[PDB]
Amino acid sequence: ATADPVKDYLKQIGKVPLLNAEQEVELAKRIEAGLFA
Amino acid sequence: ASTAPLRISFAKIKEPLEVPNLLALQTESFDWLLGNDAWKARVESALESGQDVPTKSGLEEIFEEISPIEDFSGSMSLTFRDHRFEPPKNSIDECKDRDFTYAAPLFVTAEFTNNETGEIKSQTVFMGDFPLMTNKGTFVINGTERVVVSQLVRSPGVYFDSSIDKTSDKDIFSAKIIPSRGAWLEMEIDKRDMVGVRIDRKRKQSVTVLLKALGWTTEQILEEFGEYESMRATLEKDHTQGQDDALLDIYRKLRPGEPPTREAAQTLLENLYFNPKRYDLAKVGRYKVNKKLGADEPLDAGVLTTDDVIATIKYLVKLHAGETETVGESGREIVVETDDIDHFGNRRIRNVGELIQNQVRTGLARMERVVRERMTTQDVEAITPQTLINIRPVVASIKEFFGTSQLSQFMDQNNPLSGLTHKRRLNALGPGGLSRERAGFEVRDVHPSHYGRMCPIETPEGPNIGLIGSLASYGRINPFGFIETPYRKVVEGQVTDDVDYLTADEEDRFVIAQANAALGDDMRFAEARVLVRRRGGEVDYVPGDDVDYMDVSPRQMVSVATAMIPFLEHDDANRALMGANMMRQAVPLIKSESPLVGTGMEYRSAADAGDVVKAEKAGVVQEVSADYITTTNDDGTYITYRLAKFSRSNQGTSVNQKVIVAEGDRIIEGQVLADGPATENGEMALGKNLLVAFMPWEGHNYEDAIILSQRLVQDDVLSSIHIEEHEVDARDTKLGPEEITRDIPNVSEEVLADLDERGIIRIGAEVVAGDILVGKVTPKGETELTPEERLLRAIFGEKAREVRDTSLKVPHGEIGKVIGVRVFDREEGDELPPGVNQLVRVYVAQKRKITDGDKLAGRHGNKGVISKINPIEDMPFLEDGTPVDIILNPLAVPSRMNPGQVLEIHLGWLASRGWDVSGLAEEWAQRLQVIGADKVEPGTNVATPVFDGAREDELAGLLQHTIPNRDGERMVLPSGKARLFDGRSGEPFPEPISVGYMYILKLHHLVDDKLHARSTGPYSMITQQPLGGKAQFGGQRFGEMEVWALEAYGAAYALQELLTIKSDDVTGRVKVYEAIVKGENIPEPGIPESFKVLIKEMQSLCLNVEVLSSDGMS
Amino acid sequence: DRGIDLAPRQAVEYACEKGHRFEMPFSVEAEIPPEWECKVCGAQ
Amino acid sequence: FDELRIGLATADDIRQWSHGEVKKPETINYRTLKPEKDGLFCE
Amino acid sequence: EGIINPPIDELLEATDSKYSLVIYAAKRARQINAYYSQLGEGLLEYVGPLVDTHVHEKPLSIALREINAGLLTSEAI
Amino acid sequence: RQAITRAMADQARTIRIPVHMVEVINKLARVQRQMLQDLGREPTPEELAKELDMTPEKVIEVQKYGREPISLHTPLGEDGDSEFGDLIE
Amino acid sequence: ALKRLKVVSAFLQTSNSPKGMVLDCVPVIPPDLRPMVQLDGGRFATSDLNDLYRRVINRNNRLKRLLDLGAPEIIVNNEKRMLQEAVDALFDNGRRGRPVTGPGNRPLKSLSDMLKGKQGRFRQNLLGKRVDYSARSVIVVGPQL
């Protein structure tokens, strides 16, 4: 909402959960679930 | 001894100290940067003499500052140990000829150390082509000569200000800590009876939060800071407490929007101020901080600690208390007072060495950034010092500084005074300095601390008045960088032969005498009462033995350009400024004669110029020629001094060098062998001596104009060589490559009569306006032939290759002789820019004689265009038939307030016909006898120093005793005037008219280039107005006040046609030209194209701009 | 532009899917293409 | 020329002034130096 | 032999204004110059030089001399 | 990396350069930089052509193509009203 | 309420709709007024308007591409934000925040940046213009005139 939207974008990224191996392979399995469905 | 020509001196007082090297400000600085043999000789000489001197060269310091850097694991590192230089691959003339940069390769020894493997890779790596300063004191880049001017800048340190607010009705104090590069913090006390801190002026806060965020908590703050009511009021009104709480408070205040973190805030505060990398305070900053705050032996180099900020708190609250004398925190007793930003101890000059060091440091920082990016994406055991480092940012930064930067300026080569002034100027503009828009009255004012450090007279008189000043004649430079000045030490009233150079700081705690103070037979003061200056520039005197430092010369205040003027002490300061500002614009003439009257330092102002050829080693002359001087030295070596003849300077004037030594005469070291431009006999000579007659003459010298004889045209007195350079090149474009050739299409054979076989004009071919110099033919233009042109071509027959005549032609209003041609070819080994194939340079030289409209000037700021070149017989001649060579309006000197030039013409007359004073038993006669100006042959040059000159009594007495010329009867009466006849009428003028010999200069504001006219020429592209410029056949701008004046006359039609018909109406200009040529009346005007551009611009900002007439839309 | 006779021009009407109708000229000797853009919305 | 108007230009006015869509960002060809089709500088 | 040869105050007292005088003389000079550009077309509404004419001068000189002589008048439309 | 360098090839320059021309020209730039850091001197275009196995005229053509335009509105100096845009005919 | 009524009542009496404060289309300067002229040596010089229009067109094309497929809301919102900021920079480079510099030395001059000041059309090319049939040289005094 202020100047330098690069800072705003970086905060808009936020505290997303970083994925350890089983988490992203489970997420990829859910991607396949949704896509084949 | 015999180095200088004979010049009779009117100096009454002696000079114990001679003027130092005029080029020290450039050459010494660049030798410091290079660390060459001269610099190490200087540092060892100063070490054995005990003088303060930097022991670190400008490049070894910048390389040791780049510490061995580590990765995030702290494993591998690189280190630049030693730097060395190689001899340059090109000579100076070779660089000056083929558009090269005078540079030498720079080599450094670099090692690559990894602790885990224990591996060291020592290697030598090419860092870039390093430009070198010549001995002349200039940089030769891209074939041109550019010099770098020294830059005035605020000294880093602690600054302390006092102000009063009308609304507050109380005194407010301000504290600043400005570093060399880091962030700046601002402080102020009792804005509303509370004290605060600004961190880059971001958010509101207090001082106590900064203190608690630092290493001290509450109890020591309330203990040590125990005698100031306002600050403890601030402490008690502050609600927060605790170190971590204050740290999170400053973290959220500086950058809101993120949760507080202790490690992040601590690292941010360490990096903002306490980081050795991002707050590299220079040696000057640390020195000034420990001087002002009294910090005893703080780290000589390094970043500030908390103790510096605490001492700033001490000083600010002590100043707000009102007392001025207290002991410094962690130190001795100091003084407490506010200081202004205009004091010259707060101003430091960035010379050429420090500027180039800063640019190389920026390039090295970019290189470290690139390599730090490189190591993180590179594997170990495969990194070579030749590989990981990249020298591209370093050379990019160096070439960005030397080209297109406001400090690296195009060298003015009008005459040697212009060169010396350019190399001696100090600039306040440029990056890291004060801009012209940001300037104010306070900075421009002459400070009382400028005496001996900067010239108060000479400065540009334009919009940037006083922003750019010239260094004083005796001014030296600190190792730190402040401007020093010499003084003669005084002990118990017996002045000694010892000199100490004082900054703008020691000049306050001492009291300074004058060099004009009288002395007895010994070195004691002749009079107890002496006129002195003290701290703050107050001129109050003190009697008896109370002084402790005397000046070395009365010429200490003035620059080198200002000190040339004789009888400066009789001139006004404004006209002195104008006179010193036009002597850098005078051209050199065909053969120049040294001024008959002038300051005796004129020899030193051209001997120290590098253009005058001086002996490298003492010896005897073997052969002389107009092209070379060959001297066989005493040791037996042979050296030939090549002399530039009729070369072109940067301003177009010739730089030819005459020979003054004989065939077999003795030469000592430093003796002038060949004169430079505007020099006679090694003495400096800008203009001519002309016989002046101060009288109005039929109104042709009305309003500061000049009348002069044809005797200055037919005797070739005031004329100069003007070499003009303009070139064209041949390039391979999309259609094809244009060629230089002979077969110019559709032109008579007589036009191409003076061409060579390859399409080059002959050397020595007289050229005029519109003539052909080199014949270049455009390979192809778009062919859309009309049937009329087709049948005309069928009638006459046209050449089968379709080419367009875009060959190089002489511009309008230019005449000259082709004196030299230079041809460059891509097919040869010569380097060329990409795309081009042939490049030709043609020099044309004309001997411009004096004429109407030329601008002449004296030395005292008198100036004027030339209105009439009279015949010789029309001039008012003297009693013996000698016509005057120049006629001046005497109305100028009372209003302009420069009666020093009348003294100058009287002394010029005395120096023409010598005087014989011997045994006259008078005071001035005795003074001239003891000085030596008693037996003077006719014609010998006289010398009046700038503040020791000949007095009025001496001029009157010498006017009484001039040597006779004919009939045993001197011509000028003791009143200073002579009975002047008339040329046109013949009857004598009624009363005697002042005559004399004033040095008259010829300015470079010439008339042969100022003339410019337009009928229909080139037009601008974005808007259809005619473009501007002399070389581009432009039109004079008809500004806003012009339109106001035409509205005021009520002349609607003239204004309307000047705005529509004669510009920016594409359907109007061509029709009007057709109507004029055909003879019919001028058509009605249309609508200017710029208004249509306005409509199209507004219509694109979503503004529905529509023009509707009475009936409807358009 | 004096005495020059212009080429004969014919009017061909182009209609898009959105119903926009515009008139633009073609040369008589020039071939008439069935594919063109829309002056209003750029549709086929 | 009797009166010179101004106002907000709605999208209908912009489309009325316009003669096409500048769909592509490039300006001129890099070898033949000819203006591009349906881009900037479009002929 | 110059611009000042027609006395200006005579013109002012002959026409009682200054800007009307200049547009008046300019229109007359344009008509004269268009008469010289007729190329023998013999147009009736274009009047030649009333006062005696030199071989080469500007038509504005003829206009000022004619109106200084006072043999020509006008009316406002 | 592929999409970023494709977008940089497609949109960064004002005059559009195709991606294969961009990769050719910046490969030539990087090997020219390698030559400069190797022998410490500016190489002749013939050497760079023969060490890359293209014709020298092709090298001249591609380094003529690989140029960045200068904006029309560059100030000339101390004067502010005089711009670079009014100097061209 | 006084300022609000002095602004709102403009839209009541006048017939122009207030839709135009937020826009869907951006008109372009004709190519001569934002030229790209050939120079000597093969160099090219272009106005900054062409660069700003190129930025707007690139971002509009990228936004169209994101709307073509299924994209996350953060990415689409950021694309629309950079599109809006590029259009703002085209209409006023330097009005808000750090101006779009470009080469790294000076900010690009927008449409308004040449409708304003000593370098604008109103003060440098409309009230005062260059003229043909003009000349200049130094002056001398002549008593014989």
- Could you state, in order of their start, the residue ranges of all structural domains in chain E? 1-77
Dihedral Cα B569, B573, B575, B580, nearest 10 deg: 80
- Residue B79 to residue F50: CA distance in whole angstroms: 36
Report G:54-93 residues touching A (Cβ under 8 A).
74, 78, 81-82, 85
How many Cβ atoms are within 10 Å of G39's Cβ, its own excluded?
11
- The overall longest dimension of chain D from CA atoms, in Å, is 49
CA E35 to chain centre: 12
List beta partners, residue B178: B157
List the alpha helices (DSSP H) in B523-572: none
- Burial bucket for residue G49 (CB in 10 Å: 0-12, 13-18, 19+): buried
Return the residue matching tokens 């101390």.
F78
- Residue B482 to residue B152: CA distance in whole angstroms: 10
- Residue B507 to residue B537: CA distance in whole angstroms: 10
Report yes or no: D8 and G20 within 8 Å, Cβ to Cβ.
yes
Kindly state the tokens that stand for B185: 């913090």
Best of G19, G22, G25 to substitute, by most chain D Cβ atoms within 10 angstroms, is G25
Q: Looking at CA atoms only, how far is residue G67 from chain F in angstroms?
A: 18
- Residue B905 to residue B1087: CA distance in whole angstroms: 61
Contact F65 D31 (CB under 8 A): yes
Backbone phi, then psi, for B362, in 5-degree steps? -65, -45
Q: Which amino acid is at B696?
A: P
Residue B123's Cβ-side half-sphere holds a number of Cα atoms within 13 Å equal to 16
Kindly state the tokens that stand for B632: 């066989």
Residue B890's H or E segment, with its range, is: none
Kindly state the tokens that stand for B269: 């505060």
Q: CB contacts < 8 Å between B and E, how many? A: 15
Of B70, B77, B120, which is closest to residue B277 (Cα–Cα)?
Answer: B70
Looking at residue B590, the DSSP 8-state letter turns out to be S
| Residue C24 at interface with chain D, using a CB cutoff of 8 Å | no
SS3 of B467, please?
coil
Q: Provide the phi-psi class of E47: left if phi over 0, else alpha when psi is between -120 and 50, else beta.
A: beta
Contact G78 A3 (CB under 8 A): no
Give Cα separations from B694 to B850, B890, B973, B1009 (angstroms). Answer: 21, 5, 15, 30
Q: CB contacts < 8 Å between C and D, how many? A: 5
Other chains touching D, judged by 3 or more CB pairs under 8 Å: B, C, F, G
For residue B751, the enclosing domain spans: 719-849
Q: Return the sign of the alpha-carbon dihedral for residues B134, B139, B140, B145.
A: negative
Contact A12 G78 (CB under 8 A): yes
Other chains touching E, judged by 3 or more CB pairs under 8 Å: B
- Residue B840 to residue B728: CA distance in whole angstroms: 6
Looking at residue C44, the DSSP 8-state letter turns out to be -
Give Cα separations from F80 to B741, F84, G117, G119 (angstroms). Answer: 42, 11, 11, 8
- Burial bucket for residue B757 (CB in 10 Å: 0-12, 13-18, 19+): exposed
Report F:32-71 residues touching D (Cβ under 8 A).
65
- Residue B657 to residue B18: CA distance in whole angstroms: 28
Which pairing describes strands F70-71 and G44-46: parallel, antiparallel, or unpaired? parallel
Kindly state the tokens that stand for B783: 């062919």
Of B459, B572, B599, B456, which is closest to residue B900 (Cα–Cα)?
Answer: B572
- Rounded to the nearest 5 degrees, what angle is found at the Cα of D11, between the Cα atoms of D8 and D15? 120
Kindly state the tokens that stand for B587: 């051209």
List beta partners, residue B129: B105
| Residue B1077 at interface with chain E, using a CB cutoff of 8 Å | no
Q: Return the sign of the alpha-carbon dihedral for residues B324, B330, B333, B339.
A: negative
Label each residue of B55-87 as H, E or C: CCCHHHHHHHHCCCCCCCCCCEEEEEEEEEECC
- Residue B365 to residue B370: CA distance in whole angstroms: 9
Residues 6+ apart with CB under 8 A from B161: B173, B174, B175, B176, B338, B341
Report yes or no: B488 and B457 within 8 Å, Cβ to Cβ.
no
Report yes or no: B107 and B125 within 8 Å, Cβ to Cβ.
yes
Contact G47 F71 (CB under 8 A): yes
Q: Which residues of E touch B1078 (CB under 8 A)?
A: 37
Kindly state the tokens that stand for B786: 């009309």
Backbone phi, then psi, for F73, in 5-degree steps? -100, 35
Altogether, the residues listed in chain E come to a count of: 77
- CATH number of the domain bearing residue B167: 3.90.1110.10
The angle that helices E19-36 and E59-69 make with each other, rounded to 10 degrees, is 120
The angle that helices B24-34 and B58-65 make with each other, rounded to 10 degrees, is 40
Altogether, the residues listed in chain D come to a count of: 43
Return the residue matching tokens 């020691």.
B506
- Residue D40 to residue F15: CA distance in whole angstroms: 10
DSSP A10-30: HHHH-SPPP--HHHHHHHHHH
SS3 of B306, please?
helix
Kindly state the tokens that stand for F80: 């502010």
Partner residue opposite B1021 with nearest CB, options F33, F63, F88: F88
Tell me how many helices (H) and strands (E) chain F has. Answer: 4, 1
Kindly state the tokens that stand for B875: 């001039």
- Strand spans (E) along B569-695: 597-598, 613-614, 619-624, 628-633, 638-642, 666-667, 672-674, 679-680, 683-684, 688-694
Report yes or no: B130 and B102 within 8 Å, Cβ to Cβ.
no
- Residue E28 to residue E47: CA distance in whole angstroms: 9
List beta partners, residue B877: B883
Contact D21 C39 (CB under 8 A): no
- Residue B1106 to residue D3: CA distance in whole angstroms: 9
Backbone phi, then psi, for B817, in 5-degree steps? -105, 135
Residue B885's Cβ-side half-sphere holds a number of Cα atoms within 13 Å equal to 19
| Residue F89 at interface with chain G, using a CB cutoff of 8 Å | no
- Residue B795 to residue B787: CA distance in whole angstroms: 12
The angle that helices B392-402 and B352-376 make with each other, rounded to 10 degrees, is 150
Q: Determination technique for this PDB entry?
A: cryo-EM
Kindly state the tokens that stand for B270: 């360490």
Kindly state the tokens that stand for B549: 């430092």
Partner residue opposite G44 with nearest CB, options F11, F69, F73: F69
